[PDB]
Amino acid sequence: KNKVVVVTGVPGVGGTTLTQKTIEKLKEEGIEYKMVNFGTVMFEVAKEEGLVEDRDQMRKLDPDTQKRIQKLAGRKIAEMAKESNVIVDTHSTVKTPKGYLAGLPIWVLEELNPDIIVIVETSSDEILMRRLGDATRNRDIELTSDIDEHQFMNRCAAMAYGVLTGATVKIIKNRDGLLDKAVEELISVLK
Amino acid sequence: KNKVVVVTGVPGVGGTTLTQKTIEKLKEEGIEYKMVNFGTVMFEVAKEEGLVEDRDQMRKLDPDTQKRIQKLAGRKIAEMAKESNVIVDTHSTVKTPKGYLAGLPIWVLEELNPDIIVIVETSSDEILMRRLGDATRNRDIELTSDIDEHQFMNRCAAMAYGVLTGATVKIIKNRDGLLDKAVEELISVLK
Amino acid sequence: KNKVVVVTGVPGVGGTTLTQKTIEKLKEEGIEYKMVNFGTVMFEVAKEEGLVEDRDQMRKLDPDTQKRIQKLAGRKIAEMAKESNVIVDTHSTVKTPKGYLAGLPIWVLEELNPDIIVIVETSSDEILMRRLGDATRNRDIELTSDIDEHQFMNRCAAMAYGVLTGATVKIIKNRDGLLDKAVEELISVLK
Ligand SMILES: Nc1ncnc2c1ncn2[C@@H]1O[C@H](COP(=O)(O)OP(=O)(O)OP(=O)(O)OP(=O)(O)OP(=O)(O)OC[C@H]2O[C@@H](n3cnc4c(N)ncnc43)[C@H](O)[C@@H]2O)[C@@H](O)[C@H]1O
Ligand SMILES: Nc1ncnc2c1ncn2[C@@H]1O[C@H](COP(=O)(O)OP(=O)(O)OP(=O)(O)OP(=O)(O)OP(=O)(O)OC[C@H]2O[C@@H](n3cnc4c(N)ncnc43)[C@H](O)[C@@H]2O)[C@@H](O)[C@H]1O
Numbered sequence A, B, C: 001k002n003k004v005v006v007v008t009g010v011p012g013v014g015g016t017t018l019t020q021k022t023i024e025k026l027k028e029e030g031i032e033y034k035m036v037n038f039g040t041v042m043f044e045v046a047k048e049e050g051l052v053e054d055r056d057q058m059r060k061l062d063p064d065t066q067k068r069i070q071k072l073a074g075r076k077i078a079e080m081a082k083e084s085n086v087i088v089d090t091h092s093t094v095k096t097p098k099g100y101l102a103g104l105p106i107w108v109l110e111e112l113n114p115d116i117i118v119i120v121e122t123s124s125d126e127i128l129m130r131r132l133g134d135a136t137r138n139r140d141i142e143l144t145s146d147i148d149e150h151q152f153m154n155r156c157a158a159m160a161y162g163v164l165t166g167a168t169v170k171i172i173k174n175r176d177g178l179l180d181k182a183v184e185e186l187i188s189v190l191k
């Protein structure tokens, strides 16, 4: 009871838009999912402690501070899952200056116990271009091969999640012009 | 003392053929291995319970129902390894509608405790062409890149197995026209 | 109690050279790190027992005779960390005739508990070319696609390490002619 779905992707791949369009379309049939953004759970604890003005400052903090707030947020979100189904928008790995940080390290992974881990992907081309069109959230404008490296290490981390807990790992394409098709696939997956 | 070899590969890549041709050539030098097909252990429990007419319907079931039969099948096979050496024909990950499912999740992995995990690969081209040549076992006719996606994730899970158990992870190419050469590589490995 | 940074890389890629140039330049800033070569600690226990004349003869021994000595060496290196910061030069995976053998299987990984895992990369072209220039440490002259297979699996193993411990996984390019740039990035990471 109470399903826990994790939705992941490098910044710019659009996992948030996918989650939101799928949830509003799930509610047309009375399938209620609550969206939880893990970075927002984290960003409220950080903003309480003075470590960050905004949320793009979090992947740059010392990784032991990152892991400390990540663990809190996983506990908090696990509690949210006791009340309703949740789709958790978060990361297979977070890119930090000191490397990729697993977003669900085994202790956090065990606390959420997701049923399905979704990887939202597209070509690094389209990601870089989406990142450059948004002068709101200031994201890594990195080379496309750096983007591909991230999507590469996201697959690796995510599949280890599946080896550890038995969750299925679903890859869904969210390509420029075809968001609707990513929603049909994610919707179909949650039934 | 009871060696346990796990042989993996996407459908059509030819692990059953590699195993059968190797085991009979091993028996010419007096090295007895028994072939054990994980999907058949599962398919005997499923059909006993009414879940399936055939075995290509098994990757489509409830993944909670899969993992429950998966664990059983690992148990039956762990007992088989007490009596003889086994090459187990199975899957690093199984493609299911709700994503890739680890074939040796950590509870099944520790019950089998394989010494060597073999990965049989070829180009996504040659696999698809093999799938279309066979109206006996009806298989996933997917894009060649979905086939490449699968072989990518099979490598991730297998290296995770190797991190968890210390098993070596061996990649063998089983290429068209060169089945012969793939057997020589595997026979050599089992010494 | 002090830092443990692990530096990994296929033979020929320059992890040993990178480590050393970084260690002496850190000492310009009064930052003392002790270099430790995982292969040398093993070969101190190994030639002590007669299994190898030289160190290229370790990826060639039976995979249970290695793992028998791999655990010993991780313990020695844990002891050094109580005394000084250590950068451990070792391998994400070791290529043996029986496959890739994880360099930090979970029991060794748990004893070292590295804070950061560095993967040193460049193109297999440049790596292969370096292996041919050296008639001193005689190395695997394998195809560039075999070198790529290896760098793939090193990444798979490395990210799984990061899932089990929370160590960040940093990818650093050590490109022909630009060793210095691979040194400033690692220096920058260690502050
Ligand atoms: N597990 C964890 N561990 C540790 N720390 C963690 C953590 N999880 C989070 N954190 C911390 O929190 C921070 C970030 O959290 P977070 O706030 O989740 O996100 P982010 O990394 O900035 O990702 P975005 O939501 O901005 O990417 P999205 O692509 O999902 O956005 P959108 O759907 O709008 O869309 C992107 C753009 O594309 C557009 N778009 C989407 N799809 C399409 C399409 N198909 N065609 C055309 N345009 C499209 C949209 O309109 C939009 O313009 C991290 O840096 C980390 O520090
Ligand atoms: N761990 C686990 N967890 C959960 N579920 C599990 C599981 N393990 C199994 N299952 C379940 O069991 C089901 C499938 O089990 P299983 O029957 O093991 O898998 P499969 O999907 O049917 O794979 P195949 O056996 O059909 O292909 P193959 O690798 O044997 O190729 P083969 O050599 O036979 O022949 C293929 C063709 O290619 C040809 N071929 C092979 N090599 C060459 C070559 N060099 N040149 C030309 N042709 C070649 C052959 O001649 C032949 O025509 C799954 O759906 C799943 O539900």
Ligand SMILES: Nc1ncnc2c1ncn2[C@@H]1O[C@H](COP(=O)(O)OP(=O)(O)OP(=O)(O)OP(=O)(O)OP(=O)(O)OC[C@H]2O[C@@H](n3cnc4c(N)ncnc43)[C@H](O)[C@@H]2O)[C@@H](O)[C@H]1O
Pocket (backbone or CB within 6 Å): C009, C010, C011, C012, C013, C014, C015, C016, C017, C018, C037, C038, C039, C040, C042, C055, C056, C058, C059, C066, C070, C089, C090, C091, C094, C102, C103, C104, C130, C134, C137, C174, C175, C176, C177, C178, C179
């Ligand atoms: N966890 C573990 N578990 C089990 N066993 C383990 C283990 N860890 C280790 N072992 C065992 O120990 C054995 C050997 O391990 P180890 O002793 O690490 O030796 P190796 O792996 O053979 O690596 P090398 O030291 O020969 O390569 P390097 O790239 O590090 O050399 P250099 O940096 O000089 O660089 C090479 C050449 O490239 C050049 N170069 C470097 N950078 C550049 C550049 N940017 N441009 C041009 N040239 C460059 C140099 O000048 C030089 O000529 C293994 O077989 C294994 O059994």
